[PDB]
Design a binder for these strands. Structure first.
Ligand SMILES: Nc1nc2c(ncn2[C@H]2C[C@H](O)[C@@H](COP(=O)(O)OP(=O)(O)OP(=O)(O)O)O2)c(=O)[nH]1
Length: 848
DNA sequence: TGTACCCCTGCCCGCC
């Protein structure tokens, strides 16, 4: 009747007011975009009186000063007992502050914040004087992520949205308890570009728009869901005219609508109009955030498009004057309103760790198990300004790419997972989709603390885990790997480490503090971490009884995502730029960790058990058993003995290795025993740290390492197994020298963290030279890029891009000398070093 | 206005 109900998704700050973008059900319950403009929000300032003065003394003093300063008729202010438990010195654990409410929008001095160090005769500190509008709203009104909102007193008369409402009382908006959510209008994008040798900038040739008007995150997303619409927007690449027969052939072979334009300006103008109309909640894509959104923005800026703001939901008539590495924030604000669901950004990458480059094709293969052979489209080639079939081919590649981005997006549950994490943290959905962890920690703490009458802080360096020196070599007996479930998170709870409970010297953050006595009640941090580990426990419970393989994978991501979250809770204690940075606390967590790992080793030593290796939270035990169950007895026995030492913290049997080959620290190969339904036990090769597992080692090298390990660890006569390996390698030598191997098996990946320019000794680095050639060719390469290349027949002077090599026309052949020495010999030598009766010279001979 | 979990351990490259 009078209660206006909106489901918020994103926000934006403007003119000292807060704006929420969301979805609304009308009388027929149909869902449309809406934009609320919340006014009358205030900052909760807290003045701290000196020893001898009281909140009353302060009020008498500043309330008139502030009224004059900001020209206010009246200012709400009351005394309030608040607790401080953070790194500042000279702040009492609890005091009577004068809580003052200073509206963000004031008649005068609207943006003159009160400095926290402001001193006076009555007070000496002032908390919460710089807090940001969004924070103040979400905290005061207890909003915990994307949720339904009851908004009373909605003014409709006083954006690219259907509805536009404004409220003058923040108190009017209140969260509902409804856990169901609207359907989301998703619009996947795919943009093809070409570089201009004139200005050295990237221009847009085509854009594909795959709409999915009803995506419900309540129920699961059906696989391969077909879009409710598909539309491509093509521009000429070289000349102003396409090739005769493009339209006809397009509607004959290409899926969905295809509309041709005369120049770019026109194409983008249509694109913007289309966004405004479709008005989607989420924008799917691959490398949107870090490449294509940036390009799109600059082009619209250069071509002087008026409807550029269409990308977002806020109507901007003018471009941010500072536009032209701040483009990050700028673009995020312009997109304010529509969630950017990039599957290849940090958030996406964290859900798909099995990838080495996160190329769209690789991501498709990994997450969907479907193979797609990518096509290198270079619109610089006149092949596309003349041949018509080439053009239709490129467009088709772009359609498939857009479709793949969307599918993978739904497959990895990017939207469902991020939303849930956002509701857990109480921050914004967009921010979580960006791939933040400091933000989700910051906000979960902001809420938990504020809810319990705590003052929140205004807006290597220590020793880590313990890693034992391994018993480097092979262990033919059954080995046990005992692991501590969520070591650090569990430690926090065990010894009750928290901002509120741990005594620490705030004059020296490098001074190790000490666990609090059992008398002290459980703090904030252990409580939240408690809930986190509970959630991961429940998800791993469901994963153990899931029939579908696809759903089980989907659960594995979910549990290691909640794992990342809880671990991040700890990390942010040691994150210098964390709002809740507490070096001493982190220090203490790692400390008790090491202590516990020692005690775990010693406990085994006393039982005359062999501790062959350990890393942070695990220990490996050579039991001297020839069978599984006999080791398992010693395992469960040792388990019972350590669990008695701790209240919450508990060790368990992680894996069992029929045979273990320790190479170094953090590197080893072993044979895991996996039990089946009918008690059947099988063997699987597990590897850690070894060269084969790195991206700088080609697929050939990987296969070689895997075979060598399989036979070496296989129950075969030691000298006979060695023989089998030598022979295998003699054969590989011939295959590589003659060139009887597919070039794809030679490919090497290496991510440049810096720009290829910022590499002084880059002349030696092959990946750098390759990135330089790529850029010259017109390919977008930048910090974070992953470069795939091959050494052909100085090493760096002979390294070329993979795609350039797979072009027979270029006649590029891999250098067998390099790959035999570095890619095959080096790793196998490191694989077999500590193995009995291994001969290094015999190996060197078998190759060169 | 303006982001970004922690530390541990090897392998390149160069130099003292
Ligand atoms: N800050 C931070 N700490 C981590 C991270 N990964 C691991 N750690 C630390 C904290 C963990 O408690 C400890 C154990 O690491 P593990 O990889 O074995 O996973 P964890 O023990 O947390 O869970 P699990 O054994 O799989 O049940 O190492 C991380 O990504 N960030």
């Amino acid at each position: 009747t009078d209660t206006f109900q909106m489901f918020w998704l994103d926000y934006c700050e403007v003119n000292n007011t807060l704006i929420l973008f969301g979805k609304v059900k009308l009388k027929d319950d149909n869902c449309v975009s809406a934009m609320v403009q919340i006014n009358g929000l205030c900052r909760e300032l807290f003045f701290l009186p000196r020893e001898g003065k009281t909140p009353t003394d302060i009020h008498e003093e500043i309330i008139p000063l502030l009224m004059d300063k900001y020209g206010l008729d009246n200012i709400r202010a009351k005394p309030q007992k608040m607790k401080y438990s953070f790194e500042l010195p000279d702040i009492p654990s609890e005091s009577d502050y004068l809580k003052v409410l200073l509206p963000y929008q004031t008649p005068k001095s609207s943006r003159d914040t009160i400095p926290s160090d402001l001193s006076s005769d009555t007070f000496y500190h002032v908390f919460g004087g710089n807090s940001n509008i969004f924070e103040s709203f979400v905290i005061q009104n207890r909003i915990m992520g994307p949720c339904w909102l009851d908004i009373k007193g909605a003014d409709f008369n006083s954006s690219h949205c259907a509805v536009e409402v404004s409220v003058d009382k923040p108190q009017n908006i209140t969260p509902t308890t409804t856990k169901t959510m609207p359907n989301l209008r998703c619009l996947s994008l795919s943009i093809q570009t070409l570089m201009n040798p004139k200005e050295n900038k990237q221009e847009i040739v085509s854009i594909t728009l795959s709409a999915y008007r009803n995506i419900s995150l309540d129920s699961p997303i059906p696989e391969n869901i077909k879009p409710d619409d598909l539309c491509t927007l093509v521009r000429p690449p070289q000349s102003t005219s396409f090739p005769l027969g493009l339209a006809a052939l397009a509607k004959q072979k290409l899926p969905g609508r295809v509309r041709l334009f005369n120049n770019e300006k026109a194409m983008l103008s249509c694109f913007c109009a289309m966004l405004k109309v479709e008005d989607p909640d989420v924008i799917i894509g691959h490398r949107l955030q870090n490449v294509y959104l940036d390009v799109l923005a600059h082009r619209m800026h250069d071509l002087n498009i008026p409807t550029f703001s269409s990308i977002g939901r806020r109507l901007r008539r003018t471009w941010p004057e500072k536009f032209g590495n701040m483009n990050h924030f700028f673009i995020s604000d312009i997109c304010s309103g529509r969630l950017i669901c990039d599957i290849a950004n940090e958030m996406g990458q964290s859900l798909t760790p099995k990838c080495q480059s996160w190329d769209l094709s690789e991501m498709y293969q990994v997450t969907c198990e479907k193979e797609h052979k990518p096509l290198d489209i270079d619109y610089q080639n006149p092949q596309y300004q003349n041949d018509v079939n080439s053009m239709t081919m490129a467009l088709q590649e772009n359609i498939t790419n857009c479709m793949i981005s969307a599918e993978v997006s739904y497959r990895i549950q990017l939207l469902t997972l991020t939303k849930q994490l956002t509701n857990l943290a109480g921050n914004a959905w967009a921010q979580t989709l960006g791939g933040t962890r400091a933000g989700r920690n910051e906000y979960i703490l902001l809420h938990e603390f504020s809810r319990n009458g705590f003052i929140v802080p205004d807006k290597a360096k220590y020793q880590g885990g313990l890693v034992f020196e391994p018993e480097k070599g092979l262990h033919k007996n059954y080995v046990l790997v005992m692991d501590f479930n969520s070591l650090y998170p569990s430690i926090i709870q065990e010894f009750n480490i928290c901002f509120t409970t741990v005594d620490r010297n705030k004059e020296d953050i490098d001074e190790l503090p000490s666990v609090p006595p059992s008398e002290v009640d459980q703090g904030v941090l252990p409580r939240l971490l408690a809930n986190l580990v509970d959630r991961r426990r429940e998800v791993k419970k469901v994963m153990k009884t899931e029939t579908d393989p696809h759903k089980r994978v989907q659960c594995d991501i979910r549990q290691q995502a909640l794992k990342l979250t809880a671990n991040s809770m700890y990390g942010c204690l040691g994150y210098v730029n964390s709002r809740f940075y507490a070096k001493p606390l982190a220090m203490l967590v790692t400390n008790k960790g090491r202590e516990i790992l020692m005690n775990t080793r010693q406990l085994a030593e006393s039982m005359n058990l062999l501790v062959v290796y350990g890393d942070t939270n695990s220990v490996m035990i050579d039991t001297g058993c020839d069978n599984y169950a006999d080791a398992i007895k010693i395992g469960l026995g040792f388990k019972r003995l350590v669990n008695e030492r701790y209240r919450l913290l508990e060790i368990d049997i992680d894996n069992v290795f029929k045979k273990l080959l320790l190479h170094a620290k953090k590197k080893y190969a072993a044979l895991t025993v996996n039990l089946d339904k009918n008690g059947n036990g099988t063997t699987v090769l597990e590897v850690k740290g070894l060269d084969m597992k790195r991206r700088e080692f080609c697929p050939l090298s990987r296969d070689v390492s895997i075979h060598v390990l399989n036979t070496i660890l296989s129950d075969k006569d030691p000298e006979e197994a060695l023989q089998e390996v030598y022979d295998y390698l003699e054969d590989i030598r011939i295959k590589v020298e003659t060139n009887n191997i597919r070039i794809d098996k030679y490919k090497i990946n290496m991510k440049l963290s810096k720009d290829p320019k910022a590499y002084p000794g880059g002349k030696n680095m092959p990946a750098v030279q390759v990135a330089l050639r790529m850029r010259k060719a017109g390919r977008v390469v930048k910090a974070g890029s992953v470069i795939t290349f091959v050494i052909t027949k100085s090493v760096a002077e002979r390294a070329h891009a993979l795609n350039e090599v797979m072009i027979k026309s270029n006649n590029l052949i891999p250098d067998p000398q390099y790959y035999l020495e570095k890619q095959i010999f080096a790793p196998v030598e490191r694989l077999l070093e500590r193995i009995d009766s291994f001969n290094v010279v015999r190996l060197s001979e078998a190759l060169g």
